[PDB]
Design a protein around this ligand. Structure first.
Ligand SMILES: C[C@@H]1O[C@@H](O)[C@@H](O)[C@H](O)[C@@H]1O
Ligand SMILES: C[C@@H]1O[C@@H](O)[C@@H](O)[C@H](O)[C@@H]1O
Ligand SMILES: C[C@@H]1O[C@H](O)[C@@H](O)[C@H](O)[C@@H]1O
Ligand SMILES: [Ca+2]
Ligand SMILES: [Ca+2]
Ligand SMILES: [Ca+2]
Length: 126
């Protein structure tokens, strides 16, 4: 795991679709991880890369309104982002969920893709 002053991050090495990944994180007491700042973002990227992975699902999506991205707590995307160049490109009009790659950058992908995923937990809830 990884643990900051306020959050715990957990990499779950089970291949799931985005929605199953989110429900798994919720049942574990949290949510898909939400990189809202540089510290959290780099921490998640270092974690998945240390585990030998190329990508994981994180908690960002534009499922409800195309092009309106939100975190897994439904709060909106703010000024901070780590989109790779040209992303989010809604490729083939079917990309509504977000992967983080080992560099730390973000790419939108189809939500019916399967991959490992990262949860985040608030320590006041744990
Ligand atoms: C209360 C402390 O909180 C964070 O700073 C962590 O680095 C430690 O593991 C400890 O749990
Ligand atoms: C292989 C494809 O390459 C780019 O178009 C990305 O924007 C897509 O999401 C996908 O990764
Ligand atoms: C590792 C990265 O994964 C993403 O899905 C791709 O879109 C990028 O080109 C890159 O290969
Ligand atoms: Ca869409
Ligand atoms: Ca989209
Ligand atoms: Ca994309």
């Amino acid at each position: 795991a990884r643990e900051t002053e306020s959050k715990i991050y957990l990499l779950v090495k089970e291949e799931k679709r985005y929605a199953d990944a989110q429900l798994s994180c919720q049942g574990r007491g949290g949510t898909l991880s939400m990189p809202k700042d540089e510290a959290a973002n780099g921490l998640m990227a270092a974690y998945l890369a240390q585990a030998g992975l190329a990508r994981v699902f994180i908690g960002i999506n534009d499922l409800e309104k195309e092009g309106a991205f939100v975190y897994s707590d439904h709060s909106p995307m703010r000024t901070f982002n780590k989109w790779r160049s040209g992303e989010p490109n809604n490729a083939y009009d079917e990309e509504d969920c977000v992967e983080m790659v080992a560099s730390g950058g973000w790419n939108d992908v189809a939500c019916h893709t399967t991959m490992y995923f990262m949860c985040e937990f608030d320590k006041e809830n744990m």
